[model samples]
Target: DVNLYGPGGPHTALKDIANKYSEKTGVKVNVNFGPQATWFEKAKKDADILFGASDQSALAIASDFGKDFNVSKIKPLYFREAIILTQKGNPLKIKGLKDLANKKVRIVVPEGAGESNTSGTGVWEDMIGRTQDIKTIQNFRNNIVAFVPNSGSARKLFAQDQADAWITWIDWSKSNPDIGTAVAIEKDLVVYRTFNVIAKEGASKETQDFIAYLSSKEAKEIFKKYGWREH
Candidate 1:
């Protein structure tokens, strides 16, 4: 049995592949969906199979994932960018980042995830700072009506018109076309959270073979069916 764990965002292809693997191998595969907001805590607890994004993607797993599952075989399958989602009518006349701070618009930030706790590490700190930068806020903190406790809540608020705009990942927005359009920021502020299936360090032969299968064309074919990029 293998424990497949971590955040569930805009994409569904990864989960589909895991399901297929279960059918083929008869491993008791279980998926524990962790919101992006709490993935850090889940990772620290150690998941047999983990998936996440940004610094947490490549770094959280290991600097060497691409070089080899242990030496250089595993690499990120693909990347997705972040976009600003607005209400259906786009009442704010928002077309760019500067408009996010307008006093009239209500904004919801991705603050609950890993924003503050990430401040200590330079790369993560820079990422967090960029998201919370004063320039982005433009003293519109007062105008801001909510801080989404999690990505799901954030998207739900936008869907419900409880908020004016949300800055978030593309996978969620793409997967749900019924929701508001995910307009790309003029600048690439956020991007793809790559996914990878890796062999444990000093893993058994069985683990190595599983990771190899994850990189196969058959796997890629299965992944694309669910909207994930084939590695």
Candidate 2:
């Protein structure tokens, strides 16, 4: 058995993949998914795998992850698209990022995903940043009324009617119907982030073998089943 620690944004897909990997390989892959605050200390001391939601996030997993990670051996294998969700029934007639900038709309966002710094970090800014339009960024920034500590709080603020809109990925809003109507960000303004499974050198051979299995066709099927799109 080996442990995999990462944020909750990709938990569904990663968990499913881990189950499948374990079922077939007979190696227990315990997927520990949550805000880093809950598990980083434990992971740092005992985790066999440190999976992350982005390249920077993987490095941030631990200073040593940056030191021990071998890009030639470990690579990001999946990505998720960023999108927006508004109050149920599209009450505000919100359709996309453009609507998010409307001063009349209140928004909730992730200032950071606990100690992990993922789940929704900078996704909104990067979506607008793609346009190279500072005004769009400014408008979106001002409309954001609640900057939650992480994904868990963002949903709570939405349930509280604290915000008229929320920014997140497809997989998130689907499982969390409480997030309200899922709105597709306009293609021109869309952005994405990668998911990586990090295994430091000198880790157990089981960790290395599972990382290899993650790239198999069956692993891809499990990821896509839970909303991770092709790379």
Candidate 3:
């Protein structure tokens, strides 16, 4: 049995791909999903195979993953850029990052997802600082209605009317077309998050094979179907 673990965003795609692998090789694959903040915690005891955005994965490494897994073997598979997610009609008419500061807009921020914490690092630190005046970025931070643990919950803020917009990955919004609209951040200011996979120190050949399959053409097609793009 191969036990794979990662954040919830790619759970659907990973499970489907794992099923395809199982069908082709007669091996069983079990994918365990959780919030990014808790993945490493669970992996410390449960994951034979691990994967997630590089940022989140890196945090795992910092948290003693290297002590248990073969950190030298980690490999990046693909990437996605950060974008603005808004309600179906974009009620606030949020045109760009600058608009996030408008007194009327409340944004959901991502905080605990490691390097993939776009709401905290990408939008607040990078994009806002790079594009807007100090006062504007400051106001944007001030408008945050709440800080979520992962993209999954951040996207929920719109439907629940808890937030006017969400700063999250483009693929997340694309994957849920009916839930909200995704608007591209300025190309020059866009932040990309790369996804990677790794194996345990004594992982079986099948486990390594599964990690390798994540970058295969077959896997790329599956990932594409779920809105992922090549890094």
Candidate 4:
């Protein structure tokens, strides 16, 4: 048995890998996600893999429980880009990050800090501050109407019409095609975050094999299906 834990951002991809891996190897893979609080204890006690939505998120686990996992074993395998997700149909006509800065747009983003919220942490600034344009960045900052602790919460507010747009990764929009619309950011302003997965020290051979498979060509195909960057 292999237990994998991480945030919701990568579950769409990880779940696919886990299901396929189990079928191929006859080893059951238990996958869990969301805030670490929900799985921190289980991850520390039994999880063989820790998949992070970003480098900082992976580091958080090592910082909290260095005894259970080795940060040195961490490897980034996939990349995700920052994108603007608006409600389906994009009624507000929000084109990209520049339009999101408009006061007319109500934007929602994840809090800058929290458990498993690292993916959205400072994500807006990371994507929009590329030009060093203080006025534009400040405009976007000023229009942010809601700030939740995680992507799930941000999605909720967007779904309920509490906000007109969501600043999040591309996979969220791709994974949720029915109610969400993905808007491409300008090429010059795009930002990317890596999804890194690590295993506990002294883990079994099966655990190591599965982690290795995550970087395989087949695994890259699955991740790409969920909007991950193969290169």
TM-score of each model, paired residue for residue: 0.64, 0.86, 0.84, 0.93
Worst 10 residues of 2 by lDDT: 152-161
* 20: Cα error in model 1, Å: 3.1
Q: Which 10 consecutive positions of candidate 3 have the poorest summed lDDT?
A: 115-124
Compute the lDDT for candidate 1.
Answer: 0.53
Worst 10 residues of 1 by lDDT: 116-125
Q: Model 1 segments beyond 4 Å from truth?
A: 23-28, 36-46, 57-75, 113-143, 152-155, 188-192, 196-198, 218-231
For candidate 1, lDDT tens digit of each residue in 65-108? Answer: 33333524345665555567777757766875555655477666
Write model 3 residue lDDT over 170-190, tens digit each, in one string. Answer: 667656787877877777666
Note the Cα lDDT for every prediction shown: 0.53, 0.73, 0.71, 0.79
Rank list by lDDT: 4, 2, 3, 1
Give the lDDT of residue 103 in candidate 2: 55
lDDT score of residue 168 within candidate 1: 61
Q: Which pairs in model 4 have colliding backbones? A: none
How would the candidate models be sorted by TM-score, starting from the highest?
A: 4, 2, 3, 1
In model 4, which regions exceed 4 Å deviation?
A: 114-117, 152-155
RMSD, one per candidate, in order: 6.0, 2.8, 3.2, 1.9
